[PDB]
Amino acid sequence: SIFHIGAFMADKESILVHSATGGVGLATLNLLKWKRNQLKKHGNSEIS
Amino acid sequence: GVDLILNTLSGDYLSANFRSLSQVGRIMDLSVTQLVENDSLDFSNFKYHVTYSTIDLERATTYNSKIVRDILTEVFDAISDGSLENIPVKVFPATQV
Amino acid sequence: EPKLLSPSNNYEKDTNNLYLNTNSNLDFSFQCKEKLPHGSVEIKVMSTGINYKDNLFYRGLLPQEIFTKGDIYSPPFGLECAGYITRVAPSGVTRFKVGDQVVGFASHSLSSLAITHQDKIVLKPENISFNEAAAVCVVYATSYYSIFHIGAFMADKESILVHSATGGVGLATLNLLKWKRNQLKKHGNSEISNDASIYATVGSKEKVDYLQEKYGDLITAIYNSRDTEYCDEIKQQSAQGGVDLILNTLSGDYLSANFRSLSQVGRIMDLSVTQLVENDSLDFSNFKYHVTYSTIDLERATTYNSKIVRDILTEVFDAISDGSLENIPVKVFPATQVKTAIEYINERVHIGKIVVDFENFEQDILKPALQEKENPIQLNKVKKLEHTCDTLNNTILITGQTGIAVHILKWIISGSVLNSNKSQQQVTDFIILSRSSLKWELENLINQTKHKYGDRFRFHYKSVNIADLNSTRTAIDQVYSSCKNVSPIKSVLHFATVYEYILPEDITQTVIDNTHNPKAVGAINLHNLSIEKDWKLENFILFSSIGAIIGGSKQCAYSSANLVLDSLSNYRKSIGLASTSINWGGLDAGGVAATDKSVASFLEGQGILLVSLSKILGCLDSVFQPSNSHLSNFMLSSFNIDNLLSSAPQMKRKMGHHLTNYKT
Amino acid sequence: HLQTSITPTTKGEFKVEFFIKDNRNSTKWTKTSNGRIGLFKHNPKNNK
Amino acid sequence: FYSSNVPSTRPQFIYAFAKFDKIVGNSTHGSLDIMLEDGTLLISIKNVK
Amino acid sequence: LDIEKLKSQCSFTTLTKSEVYNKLLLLSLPYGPTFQRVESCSIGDGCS
Structure with a gap:
C-alpha cells in the first residue's frame, strides 16, 4: 500500500501513518527507516 | 499538507484526511466502513490530484510474493549490520491460544 | 485633440522590447518583454499544440478558479512550446544555454515568446521537427503519467480499457502500449499473456475503421462510447471477469458503469471536470475490493517529472528509427489559421494532435503590425511594467x-x-x-x-x-x-x-x-x-x-x-x-x-x-x-455629445463639430 | 405509512430510501430498504 | 463552530479578524474568525469566496 | 487566540461605523440600520 499503489518516493514526499502503534504502522515506520538508509548509502543521501 | 496517508481509522476521520492532503495527496484505506452501501464520499474532495485506494490482502495472495521475498531478505540483512528491526514479536504457547 | 498630450516614457515603443501575443479573439496584440523570474527561460516559439482547453477558453467555458496565467479575459491560449532559447534567467539555470532547441510546458504558449521555469522543458532532440515536438508533449506525458506511474501498470500481466481512444490521449496511450510491449519482447520478456488485452471505445464507425486498419493486432475489440452495454460485454468476453485499469475520459454517467466493468484488482484514472460539481457523489459500494480511483490534471509533470518527457522523446524517435513506434498524426496549421484551427479542433472529424507553425510568423503577421502601429496618431497602448x-x-x-x-x-x-x-x-x-x-x-x-x-x-x-x-x-x-x-x-x-x-x-x-x-x-x-x-x-x-x-x-x-x-x-x-x-x-x-x-x-x-x-x-x-x-x-471627460448638446444650448456652436451623427 | 425518497446524486443517477411508521400517531420512521438507480438508455442491439 | 465556548451570558461586543488571501479573476478569497472579548474562539472560516 | 498580538498586527488605522459603511456602499452594498453592526474596524496589511 505504500511503495506500489502510491508509487511512493522515500526522498521527495511526506507520509502520515494513522495509528502507528498498530502492527501495520510499525511495519511502515521500519520500512521507511530502512528505505531512507538504503537511499543514503548509494549516493542518494539527499533526503529533503 | 502531506502527500500520502495510510488510513486505518474509521469513518469520520476520512473526511479530514482528505483535507489534510497537499495538492498531490493520496490515501490508502484499511477499513470496512467502506462496505456500508449508499453511504458515500463527495467528489468535492477530488478537486486536485488525489488517489483514493482501498486495500485488502488478496493481490499479494495472487500476484506478488516478490515483495515478501525482498522484505525478508533485506530485513535480516539490514538487521545483521543494524539499521532495521523486526517489530516486537510477543510469543505465546500453544495452550494460550 | 487626441494627439495633444505627447507620450510619456511609460510608453513602450522599442520594437525589440516587443513581442506579439493572442488576445481573447486570437487576434495579435502587443506586450512588453517580461522581467524574467529566477530559474526561468524565455523561448521563441516555432510550434505550438492545441488542446480541448484552448477551444474552451476561446468561448470562456471555465470558471476563473482553473486559470493559472491570466483569467477569462486574457486566457492562457496554448500549452506546449517548441523553439529556441532567447534569454536564460539571471540565476538558477544550468540545464540550458541561450540558443538551444527545447520542448516542454509553458503557459499561454500561443505567442511568439513563452517564459516558463526550466523544470517544464527539456532538450528537444535535434533530429525531429518542431511540428512533431509540439504534438508529443502533452498527450504522451499524460498517458505515461496516468498509466505507468499512478496505476503502476504492468504491460505484460494486466489489461486496460481506454475510453475515446481516437482522442489524442487515447492514441498516445495505444502507441505507448505498443512500444512497451515490443520493448519487453526484445529483452527476453516476450511473454505477453492473453490475460493482458487492450479494449478501446470510440464514438463513430470511421474511427473504428482507422483503429482497425492501424492497430489491428493490438486491439482486442472495440465498442461504441455512446452506449453502456460495453460494461456487460467486457465481463462476458474477459477470462478474468473485467479489466484491470481504465483511462476514463467520458463524463458523468459512464463512471458508474466503469466501476462495475472492473475486475477485483481494478483501477481508474479520470480526465474530466464532472468531479468538481460539489455535493454530487459516487458511492462507496463501488469500492468493495481493491480499487483505485485517481483523478488527473497536469500539474505534477509541471512540478516534478520532466523525466517522463525526456524518456518518451528519446525512446520515441529511437523506436521510430527502426520502426515499431509512431508519433500520433500531426496536423499542421499556418500562423494565420489560428482561429481556423481553434474552431477545427471542435469538429472532432480529425485524428491526432493539432499544431500551429510559426516559421512564417515574422513576415505574415509580425511586420504588418510593425508597419501599422507605427501610425503616429495611434497612441500606442503598449504599457511598460513600471511608472516613472x-x-x-x-x-x-x-x-x-x-x-x-x-x-x-x-x-x-x-x-x-x-x-x-x-x-x-x-x-x-x-x-x-x-x-x-x-x-x-x-x-x-x-x-x-x-x-x-x-x-x-x-x-x-x-x-x-x-x-x-x-x-x-x-x-x-x-x-x-x-x-x-x-x-x-x-x-x-x-x-x-x-x-x-x-x-x-x-x-x-x-x-x-x-x-x-x-x-x-x-x-x-x-x-x-x-x-x-x-x-x-x-x-x-x-x-x-x-x-x-x-x-x-x-x-x-x-x-x-x-x-x-x-x-x-x-x-x-x-x-x-x-x-x-x-x-x-x-x-x-x-x-x-x-x-x-x-x-x-x-x-x-x-x-x-x-x-x-x-x-x-x-x-x-x-x-x-x-x-x-x-x-x-x-x-x-467622456461626453455623449448628443445628449450634452440636447441639454446645453450655448455649446452647440462651440463644440458642434464633435458630433458623429447630425440629426435631420 | 410508507414513504419513498428520491435524492439526486449525479448525472442520471438517483438514490432511493424508504421508511415506514404508523399513520395517525407515529413521528418515528425506520428505514427499511435503500439502493441506487441510474437513468441511462440501454443498448437494445444485444437482445432477444 | 466551537459551541463548547459559547458563553451563558450575552456579551456586549464580540470581536472578529479577517485576513485577505488573494484574488483570481473577479473572485476574492478571504478568511474570517470570530472571537470573544478575551480571545475565546467561536467560529473559524478558512475560506470565503 | 491572542487578542493583543492581533491588535498590534492589524493597527494601520481605525475606522468608525459611518466610514466603514460608506466604503461598503462603494461596493454596491447598501445596508439598513438593522444590519449596521460593525462599530470599530482597524485595518492592517490585509489583516483586519
Missing part, C-alpha cells in the same frame, strides 16, 4: 486628503520606488494640507507605505485652513522646522474641494466664500507662496471640473471657482512659471458619483459618463512630463 514620475524628483504638496487623492499618491509612490535607478529622481517628502483633521484613508495609505518601504518616504501632514497665506507659510516653515532633511518643494497639486448644492434662490455670500476659500483663494495663496519661495514648479496642477466649461446644475460657485482656476493657470502660463489646470468630469471610483448611482444616472442623463481611473492616471502621467508642460489648460 519624471517631473517629480524632490518634493510634492497635496491640498485635500480624501477621495481621488489617495489613488494618485499610491501611483506616485509605486512609480517612485521603481524610479531608484537614477541619482536624483527619488521622491523624498510629501506635504499634505487639509482643512479637516486627518481622515482614515490617507492615514491608511501613509502607514501602508511606511510598513512597506521603511523610512524611504516621509509624510508631513499639517492640518490647517487654506484661506490665509500667512497660516500656510507658517505650516510650511514648521514642516521645515520639524525635520531638517526636507527637500525643497518642487510641485503642488490642488485636489482640495468642498461640495455644496445651492439652488438659484438661496445663493448667499457665505456660499460663495465656503466654495472659493478652499478652491480659488487657496490656489491664489499657493501661487503667491511659490512666488515668494522661488519655487520653479514643473508641476502646478489645478483640478477643475466640467462646470467651468459647460455649466453645472445649481452648483454655481463650484463652476465659477473652477473657471478661476482655469484663468489663473493661463495667467501662470503667460508670465512664466508654467502650470496646468484640468477640468475633469465625474469620477468612476472614489466619489459621490461612485457611491450613489442616482446621481450617476442623473449625470449620464446629461450625456457625461464617468471615466475609469486608468485613463485618469494616464492623463496625469502625460502631464507629469516637462515636454507637455507648455500646453494650455484642457478639459478631460
